[PDB]
Paper text:
The HIV-1 surface-exposed functional Env spike is the sole virally encoded target for broadly neutralizing antibodies (bNAbs). Most cross-conserved sites on the Env spike are occluded by host-derived N-glycans that appear as “self” and sterically limit naive B cell recognition of the underlying polypeptide surface. Functional gaps in the contiguous glycan shield are the protein surfaces of the receptor CD4 binding site (CD4bs) and conserved residues proximal to the furin cleavage site at the Env interface. From the Δglycan-primed rabbit displaying the broadest and most potent neutralizing responses, we isolated two vaccine-elicited bNAbs (vax-bNabs), E70 and 1C2, directed to two distinct sites of Env vulnerability.
Numbering used by the authors:
A (entry chain L): 1 to 95, 95A, 95B, 96 to 106
B (entry chain A), C (entry chain E): 36 to 56, 66 to 141, 150 to 185, 188 to 309, 312 to 323, 323A, 324 to 398, 411 to 501, ...
D (entry chain H): 2 to 35, 35A, 36 to 52, 52A, 53 to 82, 82A, 82B, 83 to 100, ...
The structure:
Amino acid sequence: DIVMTQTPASVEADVGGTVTIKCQASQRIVNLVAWYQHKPGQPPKLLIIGASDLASGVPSRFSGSGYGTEFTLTISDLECADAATYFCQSAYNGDGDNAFGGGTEVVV
Amino acid sequence: VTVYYGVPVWKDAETTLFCASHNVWATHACVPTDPNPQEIHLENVTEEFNMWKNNMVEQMHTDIISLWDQSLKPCVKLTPLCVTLQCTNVTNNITDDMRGELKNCSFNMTTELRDKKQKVYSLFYRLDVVQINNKEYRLINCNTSACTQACPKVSFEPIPIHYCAPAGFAILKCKDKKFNGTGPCPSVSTVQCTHGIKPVVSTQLLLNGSLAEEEVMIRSENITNNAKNILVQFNTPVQINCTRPNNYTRKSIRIGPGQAFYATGDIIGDIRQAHCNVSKATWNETLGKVVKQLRKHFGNNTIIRFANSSGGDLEVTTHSFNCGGEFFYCNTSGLFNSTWISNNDSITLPCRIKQIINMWQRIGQCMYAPPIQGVIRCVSNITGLILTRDGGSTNSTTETFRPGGGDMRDNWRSELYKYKVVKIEPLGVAPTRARGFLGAAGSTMGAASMTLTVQARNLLSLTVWGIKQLQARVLAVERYLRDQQLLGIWGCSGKLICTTNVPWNSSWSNRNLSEIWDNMTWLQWDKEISNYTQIIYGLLEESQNQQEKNE
Amino acid sequence: VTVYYGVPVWKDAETTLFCASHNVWATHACVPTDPNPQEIHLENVTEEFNMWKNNMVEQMHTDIISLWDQSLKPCVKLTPLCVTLQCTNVTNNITDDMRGELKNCSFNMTTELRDKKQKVYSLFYRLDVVQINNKEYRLINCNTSACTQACPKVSFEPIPIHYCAPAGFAILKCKDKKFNGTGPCPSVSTVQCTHGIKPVVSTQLLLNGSLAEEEVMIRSENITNNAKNILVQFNTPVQINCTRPNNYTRKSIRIGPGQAFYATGDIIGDIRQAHCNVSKATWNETLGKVVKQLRKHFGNNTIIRFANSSGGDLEVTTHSFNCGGEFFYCNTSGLFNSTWISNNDSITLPCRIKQIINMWQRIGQCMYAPPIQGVIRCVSNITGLILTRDGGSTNSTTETFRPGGGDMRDNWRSELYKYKVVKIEPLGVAPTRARGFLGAAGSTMGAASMTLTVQARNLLSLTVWGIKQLQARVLAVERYLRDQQLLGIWGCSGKLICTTNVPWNSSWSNRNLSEIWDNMTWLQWDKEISNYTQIIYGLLEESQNQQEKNE
Amino acid sequence: QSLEESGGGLVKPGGTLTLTCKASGIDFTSGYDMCWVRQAPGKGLEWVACIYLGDGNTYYASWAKGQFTISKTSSTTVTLQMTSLTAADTATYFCARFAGYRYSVWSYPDLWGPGTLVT
Ligand SMILES: *[C@@H]1O[C@H](CO)[C@@H](O[C@@H]2O[C@H](CO)[C@@H](O[C@@H]3O[C@H](CO[C@H]4O[C@H](CO)[C@@H](O)[C@H](O)[C@@H]4O)[C@@H](O)[C@H](O[C@H]4O[C@H](CO)[C@@H](O)[C@H](O)[C@@H]4O[C@H]4O[C@H](CO)[C@@H](O)[C@H](O)[C@@H]4O[C@H]4O[C@H](CO)[C@@H](O)[C@H](O)[C@@H]4O)[C@@H]3O)[C@H](O)[C@H]2NC(C)=O)[C@H](O)[C@H]1NC(C)=O
Ligand SMILES: *[C@@H]1O[C@H](CO)[C@@H](O[C@@H]2O[C@H](CO)[C@@H](O[C@@H]3O[C@H](CO)[C@@H](O)[C@H](O[C@H]4O[C@H](CO)[C@@H](O)[C@H](O)[C@@H]4O)[C@@H]3O)[C@H](O)[C@H]2NC(C)=O)[C@H](O)[C@H]1NC(C)=O
Ligand SMILES: *[C@@H]1O[C@H](CO)[C@@H](O[C@@H]2O[C@H](CO)[C@@H](O)[C@H](O)[C@H]2NC(C)=O)[C@H](O)[C@H]1NC(C)=O
Ligand SMILES: *[C@@H]1O[C@H](CO)[C@@H](O[C@@H]2O[C@H](CO)[C@@H](O)[C@H](O)[C@H]2NC(C)=O)[C@H](O)[C@H]1NC(C)=O
Ligand SMILES: *[C@@H]1O[C@H](CO)[C@@H](O[C@@H]2O[C@H](CO)[C@@H](O)[C@H](O)[C@H]2NC(C)=O)[C@H](O)[C@H]1NC(C)=O
Ligand SMILES: *[C@@H]1O[C@H](CO)[C@@H](O[C@@H]2O[C@H](CO)[C@@H](O)[C@H](O)[C@H]2NC(C)=O)[C@H](O)[C@H]1NC(C)=O
Ligand SMILES: *[C@@H]1O[C@H](CO)[C@@H](O[C@@H]2O[C@H](CO)[C@@H](O)[C@H](O)[C@H]2NC(C)=O)[C@H](O)[C@H]1NC(C)=O
Ligand SMILES: *[C@@H]1O[C@H](CO)[C@@H](O[C@@H]2O[C@H](CO)[C@@H](O)[C@H](O)[C@H]2NC(C)=O)[C@H](O)[C@H]1NC(C)=O
Ligand SMILES: *[C@@H]1O[C@H](CO)[C@@H](O[C@@H]2O[C@H](CO)[C@@H](O)[C@H](O)[C@H]2NC(C)=O)[C@H](O)[C@H]1NC(C)=O
Ligand SMILES: *[C@@H]1O[C@H](CO)[C@@H](O[C@@H]2O[C@H](CO)[C@@H](O)[C@H](O)[C@H]2NC(C)=O)[C@H](O)[C@H]1NC(C)=O
Ligand SMILES: *[C@@H]1O[C@H](CO)[C@@H](O)[C@H](O)[C@H]1NC(C)=O
Ligand SMILES: *[C@@H]1O[C@H](CO)[C@@H](O)[C@H](O)[C@H]1NC(C)=O
Ligand SMILES: *[C@@H]1O[C@H](CO)[C@@H](O)[C@H](O)[C@H]1NC(C)=O
Ligand SMILES: *[C@@H]1O[C@H](CO)[C@@H](O)[C@H](O)[C@H]1NC(C)=O
Ligand SMILES: *[C@@H]1O[C@H](CO)[C@@H](O)[C@H](O)[C@H]1NC(C)=O
Ligand SMILES: *[C@@H]1O[C@H](CO)[C@@H](O)[C@H](O)[C@H]1NC(C)=O
Ligand SMILES: *[C@@H]1O[C@H](CO)[C@@H](O)[C@H](O)[C@H]1NC(C)=O
Ligand SMILES: *[C@@H]1O[C@H](CO)[C@@H](O)[C@H](O)[C@H]1NC(C)=O
Ligand SMILES: *[C@@H]1O[C@H](CO)[C@@H](O)[C@H](O)[C@H]1NC(C)=O
Ligand SMILES: *[C@@H]1O[C@H](CO)[C@@H](O)[C@H](O)[C@H]1NC(C)=O
Ligand SMILES: *[C@@H]1O[C@H](CO)[C@@H](O)[C@H](O)[C@H]1NC(C)=O
Ligand SMILES: *[C@@H]1O[C@H](CO)[C@@H](O)[C@H](O)[C@H]1NC(C)=O
Ligand SMILES: *[C@@H]1O[C@H](CO)[C@@H](O)[C@H](O)[C@H]1NC(C)=O
Ligand SMILES: *[C@@H]1O[C@H](CO)[C@@H](O)[C@H](O)[C@H]1NC(C)=O
Ligand SMILES: *[C@@H]1O[C@H](CO)[C@@H](O)[C@H](O)[C@H]1NC(C)=O
Ligand SMILES: *[C@@H]1O[C@H](CO)[C@@H](O)[C@H](O)[C@H]1NC(C)=O
Ligand SMILES: *[C@@H]1O[C@H](CO)[C@@H](O)[C@H](O)[C@H]1NC(C)=O
Ligand SMILES: *[C@@H]1O[C@H](CO)[C@@H](O)[C@H](O)[C@H]1NC(C)=O
């Protein structure tokens, strides 16, 4: 019953720069956001647990925070390797169920 | 088919409750209470209560907002103050940390005569002003709505009120000491009116409420998810002492022909930061009890940690209360920082003062609190707190609890959890083959026949509470008359018990009379045959007492 | 003397009807409708209806004005705009004919701060300003009353409402397809509540109303005189397409601390005149039908001519409607110019827009409509028109009909003509010598005895509609109780039919019982003996059940 | 450790295709579901339908409730029957596994397959 939306549909930075992605939720969610990195031809890779812990297997380039209705992802020290589509989701199973954002693209 | 009027049964229902007992929650429009707390224990009655679906809470909320607004109706609306302020900081001996908190501002103010202006000044808190385009400032609320000052003559003391049921209705009360938010309460009683409940408004901590029975109680709509607040009720008070240590001088400025603004004239003595002192040992012991109880839901062997509030601006992230009439926003960080592993040194919290408030988190309106002369000190006992869980990873532990509680309703859910409102519904029908109010509700159908008069007598039995009273009275009368018209048509006028000339049609029920009258209560009986009530009622209106009158 | 309670008879009466179903005719204060249009045809009942004396119309009118006014209660009152405007015409590519319609005006406007002013401008229509003493203008309403702007968030959509009768009352409905404004309707039914009626406000033409049965109907209080309006109802729709072709840009100007004015920023593209397109062939055929019917009253061999409206200023002489929220005043000259002798080429009407309106033709107050961004187009079907005859010479022919309709009530008389409100009056008395609600009303006294329960059951049965609801409920209860007290005194409590110990006094009526019970309806019976009701009622209260209780 | 999937391709409108998802080996009797996600061609992701890898209760996107059905078929596979596929259903469909958090109802996708197309 909710929509996750993202504002910065497309961003660009040179190598070593920093970009941010802002995901707006439709309702109070405590911190339950995943933030996946998605490259074409590949399955999405998880970056964040609980809107701030890092998934095992990702560099400390990725960081984020929020506490309901708004969450952000910051990607510092960007490389061409980080060009990807980035996800946002709440993932509830039940009535007020699964929702994903449109995704935003980072070009480096 | 035999008809019984005054049968002690009920159904869940929602209706208007009346307050019973100058402050802003004025008691002018309020009924005096009867000193006798009439109460009847229901010997064998088990009822389901649900703290989260209780509409008594919703009425309390809206009545309070209405009373609040009415109390500000006659107060001066400060529209003349939307001016450019020219100002600097204050000169005094200040605490080195408390910098930039106060501004000393001057402005062009109106007077009682249209053709004359005056130059005045007042001290302001930084939180109440906006820098605009060197020294140009304005009040923050002029951006959206001029606001009324609180009348200097009204109190914000949360004097308790009671909610009383109208005729035809009753309040059920749960006495089960171990009752959590929902489910069947094994010991149910009934009252005319609830206990007095104070309309205390606060956040993150529950102030001056009732205490729990010997165990800290934890209640949640769904303990499993994270989107719900967890309410924790203490079985012990924790004492907190708060103060506003600076001695302020109050100055009255004439605004116009019958209006005045209450300015802050000056500060006497050193400027110090407001703060609250919490017993440290008490707080620590208290959390240990909370932790013991929380572990019961999150695994015997687990870790509980507390963290301070998360992002938000002020009203969201800080503790709030009204002390002495001032509005305090305190940083409860020193209370929620610990880890509890399985198997006098007071805590001092810094705190800020704000004069312009958005009461009830509404927009387009606000209230300006006048300054209070002298020094403020007050005490209170917290009786509970509001927690939210963050999350997890499925491959670890240490759930974190953080303070929260954005809504106001949670403050009252905490008292009203013991009550439920029901509607009394007589005119029971049963086959015969043609003590206290509700005291007999838990007794058999046979036994209950002796209290029909008891029940029948309780069915008829500037100002905010105006239309609400007339509507309640009219409804009670209409319900009464409709039942009487029906009995009239059926030929049963004037009789508590009457016999129809219609034999029981067994298709409606197939039990022996001895299996009904000596075993079931009327509540049970109604549940078994409510599906056919309209059949019987219909037949009785024309077959008999209409056709019979031509004979 | 035999007494019957629940007798299906009635008398004409006036009472409060309740509306049933954000817009300005807010439905907040409105009862949800029951989906079941309960209706009972009255087999042998003929009732007189009178479209011109129907007070249902008057209540609709006053309720609408009240709702209208309440909807503007929270809106900004534009008092700051009463200033001198300095202005010229507009510069753009304009239609050569549409000159002087728009002014481009600048002025000294207030801001959210008392001490600062701003210079702003807005486009205005010529109709809304007055030249005063080179380029000095002012708003026309500052002469008499500052006005509120319509709130930008409310709709003027005429959402239909239904009028429902209170307990003890009923609405009779005329089904005679050939029924003109007055007289005995041969087919009468009855309903709980009227059909939904749209509060459409217009003049000279009736918009979006109901259509007539196969013939155009002509109704008049007195077709003979000239001082009455002739209402003509079409049996076919005529489609009209209206537009406001210029693309406008809306600009918000801050007025003060919580207020804003909606200015007309600019015009995009060429400036064109507003207009309406009427199907020409449809209009011509339609008038031919009207003429055929009018000749029925003014002689078989006569001439009917139409002429445009006569003198008046704007609201009097031009067509008016609300399309898209804009207020249009259209020159219906091309519709009323023809002569009808005995024995796609759309018509285009030019039209003007006005922002300040005197709604309901009242004084001392008005409404300012904010501009609407973009381009407006809407469609409607006229279903009738209002005509007035001019006169004659007695030695000639060719009566002229002109459009008119200054009153607003005529718009609703057109729907409510089928309804009448009556009061249900039981406690019939008749000699015996000591199915649906009102379904038996057309049946004999004897037959009707079987529905007494049916009738009896329908006798008891922020916010505008406040006091009105309480008053209606109280009245219904008082009427009920008064009848019961009387039956009580007479010794007839609890009985639909009872027998007194008073033989019929023949001086009240001299008929055989078989001539009454098998021939007359209760309505007829009451008419024959209503002159003596009070005698019987009086005697029965003391002769019996008072004197008898000492025996 | 991975998900594989197939059974897509072009079917004329009104026909039916079934997608299958094969695990390389996951715990199918625990606090996880397996769930179908659709990527419309130019959009972000849409929810299609999930099944608990346990009891087997299913949840369907409301838009998919009267059209799509899913069920566990084995200890390694779950399938989606895309009954009556039409033009509107052209998309990349993905197989994913979702975890909970600690004690919760909020899920956490943690494993995705490569996705497959239907037209
Ligand atoms: C106050 O007092 C009252 C009364 O004493 C206490 O009331 C008890 O509260 C319990 C929960 O707080 C409640 O237990 C739950 O009842 C649910 C009812 O479901 C019924 O209908 C469905 C319809 O399909 C049936 O399937 C079902 O069998 C029932 O008939 C159950 O659904 C809950 O089951 C879940 O937990 C059990 C625990 O082992 C699991 O076995 C079961 O499979 C369910 O598990 C899901 O959720 C857990 C949450 O931790 C996940 O870990 C797990 O992986 C599953 O997750 C999947 O499903 C969820 C569904 O939302 C989905 O979101 C997720 O992504 C996965 O798909 C459970 O049984 C008691 O019945 C209730 N007692 C009474 C008498 O009412 C109340 O607790 C007290 N308050 C406090 C604070 O104690
Ligand atoms: C939790 O409960 C405590 C205990 O009741 C409560 O604190 C109490 O607040 C009231 C109101 O501020 C205090 O009453 C004051 O007592 C001093 C004693 O000398 C008086 O001088 C004060 O008079 C001023 O305020 C009056 C208000 O009507 C004016 O009429 C008068 O002219 C003065 O301006 C005032 O009476 C009371 O003493 C405290 N109690 C204690 C023990 O301090 C506390 O506020 C409650 N918590 C919450 C959040 O409400
Ligand atoms: C706030 O500003 C006012 C205005 O300057 C200060 O009032 C002045 O105080 C000095 C102290 O001797 C007097 O001589 C001046 O005449 C006062 N001005 C007026 C207009 O009366 C005031 O002291 C400042 N307050 C603080 C706390 O800094
Ligand atoms: C969330 O809380 C509700 C309310 O307590 C739970 O709903 C109850 O579920 C039990 C299961 O047997 C039913 O018997 C009750 O009747 C339900 N309560 C009501 C008021 O209908 C619900 O199961 C909880 N959900 C979770 C996942 O914990
Ligand atoms: C809750 O506590 C945290 C501390 O863990 C405060 O956040 C910031 O923590 C960093 C850590 O280096 C400090 O440098 C910052 O000064 C802290 N806050 C600010 C505002 O700068 C956090 O603010 C506390 N939350 C609240 C609402 O008080
Ligand atoms: C709430 O209290 C905490 C604890 O004192 C504040 O956090 C400290 O703020 C000072 C201010 O510079 C920092 O130097 C400390 O490092 C902070 N401590 C920690 C552990 O972060 C906190 O900032 C207060 N909240 C707000 C919003 O100011
Ligand atoms: C109405 O008058 C205003 C005020 O002069 C006109 O606005 C000016 O438009 C020119 C066009 O280039 C600008 O350069 C000026 O700066 C504008 N003035 C202001 C104060 O902004 C406006 O165009 C006129 N509108 C019409 C329809 O004639
Ligand atoms: C003007 O209209 C009224 C109302 O229809 C006419 O009054 C009726 O006249 C007839 C004559 O027999 C009476 O029976 C009706 O009872 C009258 N109606 C009412 C309501 O009382 C009146 O005659 C008309 N006048 C003219 C000159 O046309
Ligand atoms: C109704 O039509 C007449 C035309 O017959 C309009 O009155 C004036 O007629 C003369 C005839 O030469 C014209 O020159 C005038 O220009 C007409 N009107 C005006 C305002 O100058 C008459 O105005 C029409 N009535 C209405 C209300 O529109
Ligand atoms: C209503 O429409 C009529 C018909 O077009 C207008 O009358 C014409 O107005 C123009 C304006 O100068 C005259 O030149 C024509 O001679 C008029 N025609 C006739 C037949 O009179 C009429 O003026 C419009 N109404 C108003 C009030 O302007
Ligand atoms: C007020 O205090 C601020 C604190 O940084 C300081 O910068 C400012 O100059 C002070 N105002 C005046 C007028 O000195
Ligand atoms: C008060 O009004 C005078 C009028 O000239 C102005 O100069 C002065 O600055 C005003 N006071 C303030 C604080 O602006
Ligand atoms: C002034 O009002 C606007 C209206 O949204 C708001 O965005 C702005 O932040 C306000 N100014 C301040 C200082 O809050
Ligand atoms: C809190 O404790 C400190 C310790 O020095 C004391 O000075 C202060 O007055 C206390 N505050 C209150 C409200 O008692
Ligand atoms: C609060 O004030 C009371 C007054 O009796 C004192 O006894 C208590 O220790 C104080 N508590 C704290 C935490 O300062
Ligand atoms: C709080 O109580 C626990 C109970 O064992 C104790 O270990 C802990 O040190 C206490 N904390 C403080 C600050 O005294
Ligand atoms: C808890 O309080 C101590 C007090 O110095 C502080 O150092 C520590 O960082 C705090 N921990 C958290 C998690 O806030
Ligand atoms: C504030 O200062 C005045 C100065 O005389 C003093 O009389 C008053 O008692 C002080 N109030 C407090 C609470 O210190
Ligand atoms: C709550 O604080 C007040 C302050 O006077 C105290 O009297 C009362 O006893 C406290 N409540 C409890 C349970 O101790
Ligand atoms: C506005 O139009 C009228 C039309 O006659 C004209 O006389 C007037 O001079 C125009 N205004 C200006 C400023 O040109
Ligand atoms: C606006 O105020 C100034 C103040 O001098 C005045 O000169 C100007 O003419 C005003 N604007 C208008 C349109 O009158
Ligand atoms: C201004 O009001 C007077 C009051 O009667 C009125 O006569 C006059 O015509 C009004 N001015 C205009 C332009 O209508
Ligand atoms: C009316 O007819 C004319 C004929 O040219 C057309 O241009 C105009 O757009 C039509 N107006 C409407 C409202 O359709
Ligand atoms: C009105 O608009 C409709 C749209 O269908 C069109 O068909 C009709 O011909 C138009 N009528 C006129 C009189 O322009
Ligand atoms: C209107 O209809 C009549 C019917 O005969 C016809 O004579 C007349 O010419 C029509 N008028 C137009 C403008 O077509
Ligand atoms: C009727 O309309 C025509 C259209 O040109 C006009 O010439 C004629 O004078 C009008 N007649 C009347 C009586 O208005
Ligand atoms: C009005 O003009 C603007 C200019 O871009 C355009 O976008 C808008 O669609 C126009 N509206 C209409 C109804 O023509
Ligand atoms: C009245 O106009 C509306 C416009 O949509 C149309 O739908 C409706 O059918 C019209 N009424 C008749 C009787 O045609």
